[PDB]
Amino acid sequence: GMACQFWSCNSSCISRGYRQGKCWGIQYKYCQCY
Secondary structure (H helix, E strand, O other): OOOOHHHHHHHHHHOOOOOOOOOOOOOOOOEEEE
């Protein structure tokens, strides 16, 4: 495990239907999507 696995947010946001996903906060799976 690691805090803010940024590309793991990206691949997940693309599943939800966004073009990208990123992070910087350390809470578990707290990812933003664009």
